[PDB]
């Protein structure tokens, strides 16, 4: 219940490889050929047209995100320290997590629309790409739970941290090594909250949070088939 | 009484409720209709000038629509009515407004319209006046409030009884606390959702700092080329 030196230390780091590599993230999406309508952020009764474009945009959006957070982990001397396959099988299990935890960022509670750079994301642009009304509500329901929580850079990085260093994911070896730096984390997280008593106001914002990374797995345990399909 | 609660959630909804979206019919140029947009600061301000002008009129006429329908205030002398209004107004205005307001762009969305603090620059508004009302809107939207606190928090600020002007500042010192306590009931009677730490307190301390800026400045809020048959 308070952080020391290598704490805040820890964070400083964590905070540094985010703003890096993920805060700049969401303005490049444009670079990928998007269709003109999501340039638009009012369009009630705009037509879509073809899915090909759109659907392969959001495979370009998807890859690109998925390498940029994949250098967020490897600016952690932390994860760096693990072994080659432990990594390997970290990210290709905290990946989505992170990616819907990064995304929040540049969500809107009052319209429900992510804005990422000149473009404005809608779920019903998820629907016209072929993805499942049942998983776009639950991702949805997510984000709006996670907005209404007013959080901020430290607290989306810490809980990110979290979720990384997660030992349940298939084909770990160190599990309990790992287990321990999730722990560290966790507690980093908590104690961080309550130095900023003031300004996060939520009840039970540490309970809330991990409670929201356990909705999140359910969602991906759920729905891979979604997010598989759209990786070919 | 909790029915009063009803007068005025039914007088906000149909005359301030559709407020937002008839901007559109003022002739608003067309770059606040993007969302996304260069800061164009040399560019033509007398057509934007005039759109607030249109606008700053048609929100007050309909504030004035939604005062009209709370029997509690037409049972009284107009010369107060009037006064009452003469510094309420705007901070109505303001309330009712940010329900339009999103936290994470700072954009105002009214209908297919975009307004950014940017436009009030252009439009020539001095900094610190518009720092203080960047400061209102995020502090009270980030108390997630909904219909019954807007409404609510607006009538306290409707009868003010140390407005210059009125009459009797006995029986609005006393139909205000007539509602300032009916208030901070309701907050508690929806206590779970409306979990910040000393609301009350932290709403009365934002119509306290509205009335601030109602003040001190006030002699731009006129300004707003009254002409509208000037133009054929
Ligand atoms: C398509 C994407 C982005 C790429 C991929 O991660 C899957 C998700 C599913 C959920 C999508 C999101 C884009 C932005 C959307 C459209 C907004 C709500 C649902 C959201
Ligand atoms: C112009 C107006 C509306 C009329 C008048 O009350 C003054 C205010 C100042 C502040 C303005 C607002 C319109 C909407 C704006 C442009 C959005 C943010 C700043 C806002």
């Given at each position: 219940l308070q952080l020391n030196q290598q704490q805040k230390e820890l964070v400083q780091i964590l905070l540094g490889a985010h703003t890096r590599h993920?805060?700049?993230?969401?303005?490049?999406?444009?670079?990928?050929?998007?269709?003109?309508?999501?340039?638009?952020?009012?369009?009630?009764?705009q037509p879509r047209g073809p899915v090909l474009p759109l659907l392969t945009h959001f495979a370009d959006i998807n890859t690109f995100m998925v390498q940029q957070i994949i250098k967020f982990t490897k600016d952690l001397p932390l994860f760096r320290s693990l072994t080659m396959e432990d990594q390997i099988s970290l990210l290709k299990g905290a990946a989505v997590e992170i990616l819907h935890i990064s995304l929040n960022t540049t969500?809107?509670?009052?319209?429900?629309n992510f804005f990422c750079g000149p473009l404005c994301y809608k779920m019903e642009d998820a629907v016209h790409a072929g993805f499942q009304y049942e998983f776009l509500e639950s991702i949805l329901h997510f984000h709006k739970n996670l907005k209404g929580?007013?959080?901020?850079e430290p607290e989306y990085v810490l809980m990110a941290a979290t979720a990384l260093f997660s030992?349940?994911?298939?084909?770990?070896?160190?599990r309990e090594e790992i287990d321990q730096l999730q722990e560290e984390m966790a507690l980093i997280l908590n104690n961080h909250i309550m130095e900023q008593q003031s300004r996060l106001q939520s009840r039970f914002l540490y309970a809330k949070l991990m409670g929201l990374l356990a909705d999140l797995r359910s969602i991906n345990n759920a729905y891979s088939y979604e997010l598989q399909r759209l990786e070919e």
């Open positions: 993920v805060g700049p993230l969401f303005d490049q999406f444009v670079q990928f050929k998007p269709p003109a309508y999501l340039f638009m952020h009012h369009r009630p009764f969500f809107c509670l009052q319209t429900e929580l007013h959080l901020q030992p349940d994911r298939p084909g770990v070896t160190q």
